[PDB]
Design an enzyme around this catalytic site. Structure first.
Site, PDB file in Angstrom:
ATOM      1  N   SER A  51       5.398  -1.907  13.710  1.00  0.00           N
ATOM      2  CA  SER A  51       6.481  -1.735  12.743  1.00  0.00           C
ATOM      3  C   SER A  51       7.631  -0.878  13.246  1.00  0.00           C
ATOM      4  O   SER A  51       8.633  -0.761  12.534  1.00  0.00           O
ATOM      5  CB  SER A  51       5.977  -1.131  11.441  1.00  0.00           C
ATOM      6  N   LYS A  92      10.849  -2.582  13.017  1.00  0.00           N
ATOM      7  CA  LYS A  92      11.684  -2.627  11.819  1.00  0.00           C
ATOM      8  C   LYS A  92      13.018  -1.922  12.025  1.00  0.00           C
ATOM      9  O   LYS A  92      14.054  -2.393  11.541  1.00  0.00           O
ATOM     10  CB  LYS A  92      10.933  -2.025  10.633  1.00  0.00           C
ATOM     11  N   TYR A  96       6.216  -1.325   0.549  1.00  0.00           N
ATOM     12  CA  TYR A  96       6.258  -1.754   1.941  1.00  0.00           C
ATOM     13  C   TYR A  96       5.853  -3.219   2.063  1.00  0.00           C
ATOM     14  O   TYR A  96       4.866  -3.651   1.464  1.00  0.00           O
ATOM     15  CB  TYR A  96       5.317  -0.852   2.743  1.00  0.00           C
TER      16      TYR A  96
HETATM   17  C1  MJA Z   1       4.732   4.096   9.295  1.00  0.00           C
HETATM   18  C2  MJA Z   1       3.413   3.373   9.232  1.00  0.00           C
HETATM   19  C3  MJA Z   1       3.144   3.021   7.793  1.00  0.00           C
HETATM   20  C4  MJA Z   1       2.282   2.079   7.476  1.00  0.00           C
HETATM   21  C5  MJA Z   1       2.011   1.713   6.086  1.00  0.00           C
HETATM   22  C6  MJA Z   1       0.908   1.120   5.756  1.00  0.00           C
HETATM   23  C7  MJA Z   1      -0.043   0.696   6.826  1.00  0.00           C
HETATM   24  C8  MJA Z   1      -1.089   1.778   7.079  1.00  0.00           C
HETATM   25  C9  MJA Z   1       0.726   0.282   8.070  1.00  0.00           C
HETATM   26  C10 MJA Z   1      -0.214  -0.147   9.159  1.00  0.00           C
HETATM   27  C11 MJA Z   1      -0.573  -1.578   8.861  1.00  0.00           C
HETATM   28  C12 MJA Z   1      -1.566  -2.192   9.817  1.00  0.00           C
HETATM   29  O1  MJA Z   1      -2.598  -1.291  10.134  1.00  0.00           O
HETATM   30  C13 MJA Z   1      -2.223  -3.362   9.126  1.00  0.00           C
HETATM   31  C14 MJA Z   1      -2.161  -4.588   9.994  1.00  0.00           C
HETATM   32  O2  MJA Z   1      -3.486  -5.008  10.299  1.00  0.00           O
HETATM   33  C15 MJA Z   1      -1.551  -5.730   9.246  1.00  0.00           C
HETATM   34  C16 MJA Z   1      -2.441  -6.906   9.530  1.00  0.00           C
HETATM   35  O3  MJA Z   1      -2.480  -7.404  10.762  1.00  0.00           O
HETATM   36  O4  MJA Z   1      -3.133  -7.391   8.659  1.00  0.00           O
HETATM   37  C17 MJA Z   1       1.593   1.396   8.587  1.00  0.00           C
HETATM   38  C18 MJA Z   1       2.581   0.992   9.670  1.00  0.00           C
HETATM   39  O5  MJA Z   1       3.395  -0.070   9.278  1.00  0.00           O
HETATM   40  C19 MJA Z   1       3.403   2.173  10.157  1.00  0.00           C
END
Ligand code: MJA
Length: 400
Positions: A58, A61, A171
């Site tokens: 991410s 982004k 998100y």
């Molecule tokens: C700043 C971070 C914030 C987040 C918010 C919610 C999640 C924990 C994000 C990580 C998502 C990721 O672990 C999940 C992926 O497996 C998505 C998928 O392939 O199914 C994270 C990332 O986008 C970066």
């Protein structure tokens, strides 16, 4: 501190290494450090290097955010314009408000058009099914019986909105939609636009969206290894539920691969506001609260929810925050740390970045973890980076 904390995580076998790159606007204070080792597909080990090719996840982004704002400079888009014509898939989405007690879905037509600003700030309604319980329950009815065919952005993200456009925060694939909009209004691929408008002006040549096909880049991929022969980025995501493998085309939400050194060039151009990517006033506008009153309250509710620690990117629950064009935005100083209007986000469980204009510092910290990824440890390692870099900055300022 980073040196002993990272080494302890290497000793326990939970990470292989890390890449850290930070700088002030002028390149006076600079800290670059690669720690540990990477493993090649053959099983051979090599020291981690600053020009290893990393999976941004991410962190993509931010770069997609820049590309969309460049289209705004071109006159091809506006932040508040109606996107219904360019992206009819979005205009046709309805707003899911809840369920009956016999679990019938309740929805309503959208009250207003979705805009680019909504996509960039995650206030459009488009939500990740794995973060939004309501959308996850809707998805588990209209089940893909796993049609495994690779899917475009518009064919992956087919769920209804999670709230009326502009009135909430969750998100989601807002930047995957914004990336597609960039492709449609420019008549080329997202990689073509970014290469011309972002990478070329900064002298970046070592970047690709998934799938990484270039032989020279694959030889330097951290994530091409025996635990990840597909170079899917499993270690960064924390586990393979791979959207990457099921996708087709560029995904502006999560698709880019980049070196740490090249990523910080993008951060520093924004920090210095040097006109290489965007005009100064356009950059200034990135560092502002762009959630309205209802969206802001929805944002703070998510920040207080059980997923709040991910959405807070290490900021303290007492610190007031909003969402800018590109990430979370702090709204008050923390003395000794992020100044007000610091922009910050990250990738996966292992990567985080910040741009602190008031205190004149930016940086990215990218842990290279070992499967299975210890999530609690990653948060601690990221926090150590986020604070240790300011301690290093203070020491340098004290020595002048
Ligand atoms: C700043 C971070 C914030 C987040 C918010 C919610 C999640 C924990 C994000 C990580 C998502 C990721 O672990 C999940 C992926 O497996 C998505 C998928 O392939 O199914 C994270 C990332 O986008 C970066």
């Amino acid at each position: 501190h980073m040196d002993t904390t990272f080494q302890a995580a290497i000793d326990t076998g939970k990470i292989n290494g890390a890449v850290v790159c930070a700088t002030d606007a002028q390149g006076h204070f600079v800290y670059n450090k690669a720690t540990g080792e990477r493993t090649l597909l053959s099983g051979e080990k090599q020291p981690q290097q600053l020009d290893d090719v990393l999976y941004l996840a991410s962190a993509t982004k931010l770069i997609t955010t820049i590309a969309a704002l460049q289209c705004v400079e071109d006159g091809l888009l506006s932040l508040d314009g109606d996107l219904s014509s360019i992206a009819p898939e979005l205009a046709a989405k309805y707003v899911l408000t809840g369920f009956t007690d016999d679990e019938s879905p309740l929805d309503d037509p959208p009250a207003r058009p979705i805009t680019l600003k909504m996509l960039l700030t995650h206030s459009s309604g488009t939500s990740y099914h794995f973060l939004d319980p309501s959308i996850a329950k809707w998805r588990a009815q209209y089940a893909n019986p796993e049609n495994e065919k690779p899917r475009l952005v518009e064919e992956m993200f087919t769920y209804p909105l999670s709230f009326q456009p502009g009135t909430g925060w969750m998100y989601g694939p807002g930047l995957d939609w914004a990336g597609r909009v960039v492709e449609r209004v420019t008549g080329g691929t997202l990689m073509e636009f970014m290469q011309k408008r972002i990478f070329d002006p900064l002298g970046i040549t070592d970047s690709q969206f998934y799938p990484v096909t270039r032989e020279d880049l694959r030889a330097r991929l951290v994530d091409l290894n025996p635990s990840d022969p597909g170079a899917l980025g499993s270690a960064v995501i924390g586990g393979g539920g791979e959207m990457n493998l099921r996708g087709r085309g560029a995904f502006g939400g999560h698709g880019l691969f980049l070196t740490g050194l090249d990523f910080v060039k993008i951060l520093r151009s924004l920090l210095a506001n040097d006109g290489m990517l965007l005009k100064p006033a356009a950059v200034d506008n990135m560092f502002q609260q762009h959630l309205g009153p209802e969206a802001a309250a929805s944002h703070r509710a998510a920040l207080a929810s059980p997923l709040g620690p991910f959405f807070r990117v290490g900021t303290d629950p007492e610190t007031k925050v909003g969402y800018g064009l590109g990430g979370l935005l702090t709204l008050e100083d923390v003395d000794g740390w992020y100044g007000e209007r610091t922009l910050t986000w990250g990738g996966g469980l292992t990567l985080t970045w910040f741009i602190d204009r008031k205190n004149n510092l930016c940086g990215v910290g990218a842990i290279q973890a070992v499967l299975p990824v210890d999530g609690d440890l990653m948060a601690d390692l990221k926090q150590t980076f986020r604070h240790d870099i300011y301690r290093k900055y203070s020491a340098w300022k004290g020595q002048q």
